[PDB]
Design a protein around this nucleic acid. Structure first.
Ligand SMILES: Nc1nc2c(ncn2[C@H]2C[C@H](O)[C@@H](COP(=O)(O)NP(=O)(O)OP(=O)(O)O)O2)c(=O)[nH]1
Ligand SMILES: [Mg+2]
Ligand SMILES: [Mg+2]
Length: 424
DNA sequence: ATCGGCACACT
DNA sequence: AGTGTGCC
């Protein structure tokens, strides 16, 4: 079936922008982006409001270039600490949202601004409490039903379409059977409406949600009606939805694997995957992937929503690209120390707030003219949350790397990460 | 010089 | 353990 569970995916809209907009009222309802490291081309853009997007502004764009596209664009700068970007403000805002969501159901923190929710149980409970009662259209004020309306002047308006689709969906719904997968999705959507309302009221942040039977579909659904809307993707909408759906849009298919599927199989849409047998797919892409693709193109995925609200690892890194690369011993030690200081500050907060300690410290370095993203990876024991010792240990482990009071080759990157957390 | 940052599969 | 991928 693949209609066994109810899963939702919630994602904040232009999250960093919202954080800056809440803190500054002036940036509200204006085109704006968030940038870091202004010196170079005005800084790199990592977050763009929807007002700015209408002008074509995107992340990974230089602020100066963005200005050319959008003359009145307002910019917000990431806090800078110890010579590197500090994402503390956004991490704290993130916790706020996660905490509200946690109240409604067990969630999986997928990223800083999105979380997966398994509502299977909550939906069942709700059904019992409102048992025998129809679902009013009023309960789903921002819900879109994928694939509707269908068949037969309101439609010209976006809102008109949404209302008509929802009416058709609700009208079709049979209150009589609790078991119906579609009914459970509708109830789950009501819960997500309530959850989204709570988030907006308590944090002031707007967000979008996708409600479906699995995480991949939920994610896909979420992206359909951004921003400030939630989309319900039923099992039945999948054939029509997937039929013109590019392969790269499915989660985890945006990279090389997706490209292999397209290149090898000679298809461009998700639906086209249905013709191939499971065995064929497994032979081309492996047993695990083959199984996943065969099931996925039919709208079925079984990956569980992990009950995890905390990051497994905590790391900080800095790039020194091109000329800026560190060529001296003293430089490497100084930067290692800076990294260690931020790490210690985050670690202490983690120990006090989450009551756990990290057992392993990981050091990563890159050198000039290296094809590999990570030039080297090393780990050492992390006995105490002390910056001086941590930097010294990292240096001790990577001291052997230098080929030549000078360092050679110069280092493109420094990376420290704390891992292997244990209860304390 | 599109940065810093997470999780996972594979060996 | 260390490497490589994919995403936010
Ligand atoms: N440094 C950095 N931060 C990033 C990057 N990509 C995203 N972020 C940070 C900054 C982002 O604000 C935040 C959330 O990631 P999204 O959900 O993928 N995009 P948003 O919520 O902005 O918009 P919407 O969801 O409505 O399209 O993660 C990046 O490539 N680099
Ligand atoms: Mg977002
Ligand atoms: Mg996101």
């Amino acid at each position: 079936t693949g209609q066994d569970r109810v899963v939702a995916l919630v994602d904040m809209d232009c999250f960093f922008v919202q954080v800056e907009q809440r803190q500054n009222p002036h940036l509200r309802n204006k085109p704006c982006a968030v940038v870091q490291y202004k010196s170079w081309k005005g800084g790199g853009i990592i977050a763009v409001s929807y007002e700015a997007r209408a002008f074509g502004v995107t992340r990974s764009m230089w602020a100066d270039d963005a200005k050319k596209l959008c003359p009145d664009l307002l910019l917000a700068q990431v806090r800078e600490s110890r010579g590197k970007a500090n994402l503390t403000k956004y991490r704290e805002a993130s916790v706020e949202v996660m905490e509200i969501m946690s109240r409604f159901a067990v969630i999986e923190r997928a990223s800083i601004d999105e979380a997966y929710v398994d509502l299977t149980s909550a939906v069942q409970e709700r059904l019992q409490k409102l048992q025998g009662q129809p679902i009013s259209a009023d309960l789903l004020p921002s819900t879109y039903i994928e694939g509707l309306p269908q068949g037969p002047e309101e439609t010209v308006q976006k809102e008109g379409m949404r209302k008509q689709g929802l009416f058709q969906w609700l009208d079709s719904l049979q209150i009589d059977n609790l078991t119906s997968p579609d009914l459970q999705l509708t109830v789950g959507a009501v819960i997500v409406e309530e959850m989204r309302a709570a988030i907006e009221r308590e944090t002031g942040f707007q967000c979008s949600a996708g409600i479906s039977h699995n995480k991949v579909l939920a994610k896909l659904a979420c992206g359909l009606n951004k921003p400030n809307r939630q989309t319900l993707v039923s099992h039945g909408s999948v054939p029509q939805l997937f039929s013109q759906m590019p392969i790269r849009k499915i989660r985890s298919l945006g990279g090389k694997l997706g490209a292999s599927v397209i290149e090898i199989l000679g298809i461009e849409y998700m639906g086209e995957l249905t013709q191939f047998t499971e065995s064929q797919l497994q032979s081309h892409f492996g047993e695990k992937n083959g199984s996943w693709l065969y099931a996925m193109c039919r709208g079925i995925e079984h990956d569980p929503v992990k009950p995890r609200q905390l990051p497994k690892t905590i790391g900080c890194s800095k790039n020194f690209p091109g000329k800026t690369a560190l060529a001296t011993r003293e430089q490497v030690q100084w930067w290692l120390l800076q990294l260690a200081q931020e790490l210690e500050e985050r670690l202490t907060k983690d120990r006090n707030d989450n009551d756990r300690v990290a057992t392993q410290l990981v050091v990563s370095i890159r050198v000039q003219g290296d094809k590999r993203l990570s030039s080297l990876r090393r780990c050492c024991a992390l006995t105490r949350y002390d910056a001086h010792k941590m930097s010294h240990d990292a240096f001790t482990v990577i001291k052997n790397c230098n080929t030549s009071t000078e360092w050679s080759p110069p280092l493109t990157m420094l990376f420290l990460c704390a891992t292997k957390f244990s209860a304390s």
